[PDB]
Design a protein around this ligand. Structure first.
Ligand code: E8N
Ligand code: E8N
Ligand code: E9E
Ligand code: E9E
Ligand code: ZN
Ligand code: ZN
Ligand code: ZN
Ligand code: ZN
Lengths: 330, 330
């Protein structure tokens, strides 16, 4: 009956409106400590993130899930500072994304499971902050090491009840292999969110996952390079489907009976060093509402398309609570 | 007339007997902070490193050059602690090795040059400790990003006078391309050590580098898996040439007139997470003298083969001082 945040345990009812896939800073391990000037300064990144989380809170957000791992350069003391200053709860992550270093890539399934358990059960670094979610990734067929990560994540979730959330190449149907691996370890689909699932329009894929009990992460709604066809790096990252096209998948899955399994977010960030220089500027130009885009723009859009207020509340409040609530089955 | 160490500037004469390619811990950025139990504990790694540096100092070592970068998980506060406790000077490194994360790999030559300059001229992280060498790497033909790193390293050296030291796949003759890149930027060969050069027996390659003025890093003398043919991972890392075979390259280059350009070391470490589990144990079994192997075993070997005491002192004391001494030409 409690979820770990960067400021400690909170009750389920305190989570409130929750964005389930967000980042304070998308970086690399040690990078913000070694090269803070890349972001202007650490203080500038903090100020930017607080301003943004304050705008989100004013729009109705109460909690974000920062799904930055070790290899995304998660800095839990930065998250704690931002969380305190903005009065928005932040749930931190363990796991590994797509850029693990050699010291992680050479590890066994057992060793990885120890590491993820450490961050859930003991703490991150020497901070005593415990993760409330496990983040994993593939981009196409899993590498051998990613198979180990997905298995370790399953083990860590089976021991603790903390959920797993994934990065996919959704157009490659990665969620099918991720599911297979997780199920081979015994993990309940109700403890797993298959993320970046709004990157595809393939309903045969989305419903195959939802029918087995997976949560479906429609988590990049404002990601679009429409109107930036000249910028190859922004097109490659963001794609050329509209935010409306992505948002309508929320309606599609509601219409198929999966309202309880949908998790919505922006996949936004306040700093971004793991891609091209100045990408954060480009992104901010596309979506000046930042993390507030879901409540300010997506919710009203969906209401105008005939989705109910009650259904939207269930998606933004009930589903994240049920997901984040530690349990073996949800 | 001063070299930066983890405890501040020292005079040239204070450097004394210097090992020019060593590691306290071979790891990954953030790893020791996130997963100290991999090493037993941080305190255990500190104790091990102090014991080892004390044994080296008793054998005549006064300074080591820790050529661990950002991506080797260099922890300058760990180096400072070990340096204080063992009374051995440690020179820290900037640059990038073979495992840079996305936040580094996406950067330009200019950006990289700023980062290396930061670590030389201002400090590492928030510690105020400044690097005294720039470390770079290729394993075969340079990737596009490694070309940028080598160019940035050249720029940073041209601005500050701090030398560059390299990781090679010596059997692939990487030093030839590294030289070409460095020279394309204007860098003097006398400011560059082409490292892991004892990994090859190709004198046509070694002398081609030394003839242009490069320092030659014969830096892995005790690395050998002879008598561990059953251990594939140790054979792959350490090779199947004897330490004597490697040591005799020091004599070969003396005999060709290059005594002033030879730099000798062990390429040892006290923790090693970026390879197979328990590799440190295997390595310690092969060479229980650790960093003391050069003075305890290599120097007497070379004397018995007819190299002079004076020549060996010039190699272990004069050459490292001339190399580390900030200058545009040495
Ligand atoms: C919230 C209420 C249920 C519907 C109308 C689906 C029948 C969706 C909106
Ligand atoms: C140190 C003195 C010079 C030699 C003998 C090379 C002639 C090497 C040893
Ligand atoms: C830090 C970037 O992480 P993603 C994979 O969600 O893409 C923006
Ligand atoms: C940390 C390991 O670095 P290398 C390339 O000198 O090999 C042991
Ligand atoms: Zn992702
Ligand atoms: Zn993300
Ligand atoms: Zn090396
Ligand atoms: Zn090395």
């Amino acid at each position: 009956d409690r979820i770990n945040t960067v400021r400690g345990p909170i009750t389920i009812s305190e989570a409130g409106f929750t964005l389930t896939h967000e980042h304070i800073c998308g970086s690399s391990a040690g990078f913000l400590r070694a090269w803070p000037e890349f972001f202007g300064s650490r203080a500038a990144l903090v100020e930017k993130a607080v301003r943004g989380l304050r705008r989100a809170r004013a729009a109705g957000v109460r909690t974000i899930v920062d799904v930055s791992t070790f290899d995304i350069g998660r800095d839990v003391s930065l998250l704690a500072e931002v969380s305190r200053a903005a009065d928005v709860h932040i749930v931190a992550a363990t796991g590994l994304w797509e850029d693990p270093p050699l010291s992680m890539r050479l590890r066994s399934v057992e060793e990885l499971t120890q590491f993820f358990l450490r961050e859930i059960q003991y703490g991150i670094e020497d901070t005593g902050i415990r993760a409330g979610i496990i983040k994993v990734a593939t981009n196409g067929k899993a590498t051998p090491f990613q198979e180990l990560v997905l298995r370790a994540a399953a083990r860590a979730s089976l021991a603790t009840g903390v959920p797993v959330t994934t990065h996919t190449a959704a157009s490659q149907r990665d969620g099918e292999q991720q599911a297979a691996i997780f199920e081979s370890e015994g993990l309940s689909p109700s403890r797993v969110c298959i993320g970046h699932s709004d990157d595809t329009d393939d309903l045969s894929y989305l419903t195959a996952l939802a029918a087995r009990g997976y949560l479906i992460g429609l988590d990049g709604i404002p990601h679009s390079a429409i109107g930036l066809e000249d910028n190859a790096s922004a097109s490659a990252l963001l794609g050329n489907r509209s935010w409306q096209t992505r948002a309508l998948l929320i309606k599609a899955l509601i219409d198929q009976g999966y309202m309880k399994q949908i998790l919505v977010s922006n996949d936004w960030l306040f700093g971004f060093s793991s891609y091209v220089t100045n990408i954060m500027d480009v992104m901010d130009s596309v979506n000046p509402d930042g993390m507030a885009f879901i409540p300010l723009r997506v919710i009203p859009f969906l209401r105008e398309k005939g989705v109910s207020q009650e259904t939207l509340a269930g998606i933004t409040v009930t589903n994240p609570a049920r997901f984040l609530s530690p349990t073996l089955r949800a």
